[PDB]
Amino acid sequence: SVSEIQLMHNLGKHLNSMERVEWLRKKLQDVHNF
């Protein structure tokens, strides 16, 4: 049904969310430093 390009798009968004959440968790001490 859903094209491969749409699954790839949705998977890409989920991957971005994972990566951005973990990035912020790691750099949260640096963000407080300002």
Name the residues that contact a copy of itself, by CB under 8 A. Answer: 1-5, 7-9, 11-12, 14-19, 22-23, 26
Q: Vertex 23, ends 26 and 19: CA angle to 5°?
A: 140
Beta carbons of 21 and 14 less than 8 angstroms apart: no
- State the minimum distance, in angstroms, from the CB of residue 32 to a copy of itself: 16
